[model samples]
Every structure is written in structure tokens, then in C-alpha cells.
Target: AAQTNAPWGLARISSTSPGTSTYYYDESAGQGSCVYVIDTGIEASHPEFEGRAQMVKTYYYSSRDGNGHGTHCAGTVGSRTYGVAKKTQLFGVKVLDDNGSGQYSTIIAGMDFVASDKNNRNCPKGVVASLSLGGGYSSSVNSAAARLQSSGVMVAVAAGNNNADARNYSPASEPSVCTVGASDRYDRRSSFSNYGSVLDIFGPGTDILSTWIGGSTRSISGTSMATPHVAGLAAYLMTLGKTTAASACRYIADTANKGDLSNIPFGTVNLLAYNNYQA
Candidate 1:
């Protein structure tokens, strides 16, 4: 069977064209790479992940995903089905607890941990840190993201889902983080997604179906869902031998689907999500 549709968000960017040779991103699928989901934790036993997911650190409760948010985000990043990078290693950094809440300091600590040990890890293609949680601005979080970006760790954070300017959010507004907004199946900005100058790109977030805890699947809608799509793409680029975080980000932006978003006022720039592998 040939690839007939781009994976979720990839189609919106024209990264895939139905029945065409260029319709899919054929380069890689996150092999030899890693992405850290710095959120509520992950279900290491999730069937879709097939044992590829692990918890590297925990800030509050045990690393097991008590709330399914982190697991859902993780699946979108690298599950065998609903994922952009199917083969990427998934590491969970439990910054938020079972109640889906965490202190700013805990989140900052997770960022620092990922940045410091990224290179020493077995992943030769480097690491991508995906943070789906946000709050008001935190200078410390911004600096942490900056440090990680400077050290060649790709960081993707979600623009808040409050349907307002994202600049008021912490990691989303963090200068060095790749701030992601949500887009719908129709290629329009999601009604609940935050927008403005701070957002770097848009991805499918509405009713996104992916893996969940207790060996189930579910549809979720939020900027959190959109962030993993970009994170997975970043990991895919890393697997393609992109040596630096800046270069990976550049490739994503340079290859983005801008035509579809020309008429939209969703952000400072009308950049849409894309993938480097699928077809």
C-alpha cells in the first residue's frame, strides 16, 4: 500500500500530496533520536509505544502516568500509529504531578536536567525536550530553554490554550523555545489556541487521537497536542544527521508550508507544520 495521506498536521503544510511521490516525508522516523516529554509523566507500558517509552526523571509522584495527559502527548510524538516520529525513543520527565499541576521550579529543573545530560546520553542524534505545560512568564524557564537551545537540545513548548496572546505564558514566550500553536483539521487556527508574535508554528490539535493510559485511546484538543507534532519532527531531523538545534529549527521553518497560512492572522508569521519523513 502506498501512502495516500500525510500524517495529521503534515498534510496541512502540503508536506504530502495525495498519490504523489513527494506526498510523504521519506527521510527518517526518529530512529537514533530521543524526545523528552517534560509533563505529568508517561505510561511506560502503553501498547502503542511498545516499550519504547521510559521515565528518566520524576519531580513529584512516581514516574508512572497517573493522569493521562503526559501519555497522550507522548504518543503523538512517537507512537507507532498516531505519531510523527514512530521510532524515536520517548523519555518522560515528570515535572507535573498526578493532578496535572507543578511549581515553576520543578519545570525549570526538568529543563536543566535534559540540557545537561543530553549529549552524554546514548542518543547520538541529540535530544528534543517537549513541554506542554505553561503559566505566566518565568525568567528562569526562559533562560533554561535558551541554555538548552544553545547546547543543541531542541525545545518545543505549547502556546497556552486560552485563546489569547501567547506572550503572557512562560515557556511559550521563552525566546529560545519553539512556541507552537494549535490548528484544526481544516487547516485553520484552532478557536481555543493562543496566538500572536510569540508563536513559531501551528499544528493539528483539535480532536487529535492518540494513545492513552489503561491501554486505551482518546481524542484531545489543546496547544499541548500541537507541540508534540513539532517535537517529533525535530527528532526526525536530528535522525537525519542535523548536528545542531539551530539547524534543525531552521530546516523546519525553511521547509514549512507557508502558502496555506498566508491569509491567516494566527501569529507574527504564518508558518505551518511539516515533516521530513512519511512517504
Candidate 2:
């Protein structure tokens, strides 16, 4: 069957069709690629994952996803039914505890783990990290994310839900990390999405439905939800030989639908994310 209707967020990216009733995105199987969810752990056994999600590593915290944030974002990245890149392996790095909070040191340690991924050294094309979390500006986090990018792993972060300038956030403020803002079904920027020149692109973030804890599904809204969509696309691009972080980021921006979003801040790029299925 041809895919005609999809998640509003995913549908909006592939083609900028007039109106927002129906949507379709390219069906790209992210078979060999990997995306690490750097937040609370994922359920891993959710039906949407089909055994492709797992706990790759964890900090000194309860590696449980009681918060459901990590699972939702992970599903948006590569779950079978509600994901941008179906079949992509999603690994839970579990930087945050079930409380949905972690120390900057812990987050940086997770970045170090991502950099140590042997696949990044051996292949480097298809590894990305979806950080649907953010905090106040931290030079350590910024530099760590930059090191992660330079180490061959692509990083995608949420601009934040503060509705303020994203420049005050950590990895989101980092020039190297691919910072993303949230948009809605009407192609309007989410009211709470942080903006400004720090954002590389915008993605669907409002009322996004994805896998949750206890083998269920739910809908949520925020820049955290939007970031994984970008990470999912980044992993797909990496599978297409957009190997390096710089090259993949370049392609993501170069191939976007420019000037399509509404309510974008004055200093923002005004670029909406576009995948390869704009048929």
C-alpha cells in the first residue's frame, strides 16, 4: 500500500503540499544506522521498536524511563510505526534518570561514550545522537557536543520550550550541534519553542504521538519532540553517504524548505526540515 497519511510532523517534512490534511514521507529503512537517545532510558520492548531498541550505556542513575521522554523521542527517531527512519537501531544512552534530570558531568560522559562508539570510527556515516533535552548554557556541554561532532557522530538537540532565545541553552547554543525548533501542523512555530540564530532548522514538534513506557503510545509537545525528527533525518542522510557530521548538517540545511514556517523569530533561519521524499 502506498503511504498517503502519516504523522503530521513526518508528513510535513517530505513535501510542502498546500494545506495540511494529508501527508507522506519517504519510507527509508535505516537498517545499518544507529541513533542514541541521550535521556531517560527507553522501554526497549515497545512493539514499535521490534527489538531494535536497547540500553547501550548508562550513568550512575536509575536507568529506567519512568519519565517517558526518552522513549517518545526514541520512537520519533526510528520506531517501526511512528518514526522518521523505520528500522534504524535506537540505543538508549540513559544520561538522565527517571526524574528526567542529570548533571552536566553525566551528560558529558554520555557524549564521551558516543565518541567511543567503534562504529563511528569504522563507518562514521550512520551514527547520530538525539538529545531531546536541554539546560542553561554550559561551556562544558557545548564543547563536549562539539567534540562529539568532530569525532564523527552527529548531534541533534532541542532548542528548548522556553520560547526565549535558544542562545541561552547549552548544546542547543553550540554552533556545532544541529539545534532544532518546534513547529505545528499549521506550519507555525510552537509558542514555547526557543528561537534565534542558534537553530539550524525547524521540525514538527506539537502534539507528536510516539511510543511511551509500558508498551503504550502517547502524544506530547515541545522542542524535545522536534529534535528527534531532525536526528532521524540525519541518520537517514548518513545512510546515504552523508558520512561526516559537517556534511550531514550541510545537507540537512541545504535541502530544507526555506521560508515556509510562520512565527519564526526575526533572527532565525526560517528553514523547515525537508527529507528526500518530496515527490
**Winning model by TM-score:** 2
Q: Write the per-residue lDDT of candidate 2 for residues 5-99, one digit (tens) a residue.
A: 56778777766652553445444456678888899989897888999888878885566788899999999998877888786888888998888
Model 2 TM:
0.93
TM-scores of the candidates are 0.90, 0.93
Q: Look at candidate 1 and tell me the lDDT of residue 225.
A: 93
Model 1: residue 160 alpha-carbon error in angstroms:
1.1
Tens-place lDDT per residue, model 1, 1-279, is: 123443455444335332232124444678889899999998988788989999989987488889999999999898877777778999999999999889988888888888876766778776898889999887887887888788778889999888888888888898767889887776677898888888888777887878888988888899999999889888877887754566666677777777554235634767777763444
Q: In order, what lDDT does every prediction score?
A: 0.79, 0.83
Top of the candidates by lDDT: 2
